[PDB]
Amino acid sequence: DSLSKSPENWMSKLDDGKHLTEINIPGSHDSGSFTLKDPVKSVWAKTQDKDYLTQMKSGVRFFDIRGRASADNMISVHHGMVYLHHELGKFLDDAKYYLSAYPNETIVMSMKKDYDSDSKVTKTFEEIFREYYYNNPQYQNLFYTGSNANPTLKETKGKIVLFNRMGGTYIKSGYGADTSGIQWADNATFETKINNGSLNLKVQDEYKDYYDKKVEAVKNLLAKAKTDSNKDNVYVNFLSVASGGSAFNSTYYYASYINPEIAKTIKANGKARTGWLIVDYAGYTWPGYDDIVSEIIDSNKL
Ligand SMILES: C[N+](C)(C)CCO
Ligand SMILES: C[N+](C)(C)CCO
Ligand SMILES: [Cl-]
């Protein structure tokens, strides 16, 4: 059986000497938005319909968590201004539960501030995450705390590895975990060195593209990863794209074309390096069309 037939424990089937950068990982864009039920606001603000545990059982291993500091000890999960009905502990609790059940998987968790803090807040978003989550005794043992800037599956499995979008941080473990953080370009394909030049991050995050330009941008970075065997290069390729507003195409509309187009491309490439591909409506299938999460999983060599 191919790896995608067992998406709950697909990492457990790989050689754990691989660096995570070398694994082809499916991620979900604005992971926590599955809570939204308002159909007007959902056109533009909603990007998933499966909850965190269901995304995990479906093979998603990179979670894009964007937040707003709602109290000096709390980060709320957001899509910009839009509150997603939960705080960050809910994601961490679900991740902890999953990684205990499937201990040979690793989760990569991106953390970004997506909106200004509540007026009562006195601490920076980075301070709050560092002191009330990362260093919270409650999450002892949950996070990758090692000092390798390019960690392997063996040393990260069972744990969450921080992918730091917060800017400079005093946290010392995970991608971008130094006082420079990651220099991220708005609406662009870009490359930037992270972890004190230890890694070359290559991102396609042109989130305001229209359809044909977005497919072009995804396939261009997909083609670069295919010929790049350098373990010190890390590829993050967002398939997700913004709606132009409620009267325009929904994010689901675009996902419904992009996901199968890119899934078709990957499958026709066979077992080639893709990088980490971040998608809307992860696990959403359309009869007759290739499933992007399954095809990213099956692209991994055994
Ligand atoms: C979604 N289509 C491929 C039909 C057109 C692009 O906007
Ligand atoms: C018909 N779908 C939108 C499901 C796939 C298009 O390519
Ligand atoms: Cl801040």
**Shape field:** globular
Q: What small molecules are bound in this structure?
A: choline ion, chloride ion
Write the CATH homologous superfamily: Phosphatidylinositol (PI) phosphodiesterase
CATH class category:
Alpha Beta
Number of DSSP strand runs: 10
Order of secondary-structure elements: EHHEEEHEHHEEEHEHEH
What fraction of the residues are assigned to beta strands by DSSP? Answer: 15-25%
Structure class: alpha/beta
Total of helices: 8
CATH architecture, please? Alpha-Beta Barrel
Largest pleated sheet: 10 strands, mixed
Helix content: 25-40%
EC number: 4.6.1.13
Function: Cleaves glycosylphosphatidylinositol (GPI) and phosphatidylinositol (PI) anchors but not PI phosphates. Potential virulence factor.
Catalytic activity: a 1,2-diacyl-sn-glycero-3-phospho-(1D-myo-inositol) = 1D-myo-inositol 1,2-cyclic phosphate + a 1,2-diacyl-sn-glycerol
Keywords: Lipid degradation, Lipid metabolism, Lyase, Secreted, Signal, Virulence
Please explain how this structure is put together.
- Helix content is 27%, strand content 20%.
- By secondary structure, the chain is α/β, with parallel strands linked by helices.
- It has a single domain, classed as Phosphatidylinositol (PI) phosphodiesterase (TIM Barrel), CATH 3.20.20.
- Strands 1, 2, 3, 4, 5, 6, 7, 8, 9 and 10 form a ten-stranded mixed beta sheet that branches.
- The longest helix is centred in the last third of the chain and has 18 residues, at 251-268.
- The chain binds choline ion (CHT) (2 copies) and chloride ion.
- The site of one choline ion has 5 residues, from helix 7.
- It holds the Pfam family PI-PLC-X.
- This is 1-phosphatidylinositol phosphodiesterase.
